[PDB]
Amino acid sequence: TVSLWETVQKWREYRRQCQRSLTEDPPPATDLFCNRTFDEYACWPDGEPGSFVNVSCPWYLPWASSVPQGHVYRFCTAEGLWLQKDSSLPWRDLSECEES
């Protein structure tokens, strides 16, 4: 079984890679993009207005080998805002990344 410490270490590496991406990725094509962010779970890039944004299941997951084709989703509204839950948190679908 994968230990808590092993998962914590890989999560820290994932967070560090995310912060490199947030700093290094080129600016969006326009200001109407939803803005990149790290929500403690997934690393989100800039979002195209009016489109779903898909990110691979975070590779630090203990069961990541069981969901290799899965994606976590956000929705970027036409006004450049991440879709919000009715909670003031962004809408998120993690179903493809849940443990089998």
Partner: peptide, 27 residues
Amino acid sequence: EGXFTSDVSSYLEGQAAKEFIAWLVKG
């Protein structure tokens, strides 16, 4: 199957990592 003490102790150890993920997700 799943009838031995090591099965339960291993289950416990794996729950620590899983609760960490749930903590990341829910907040």
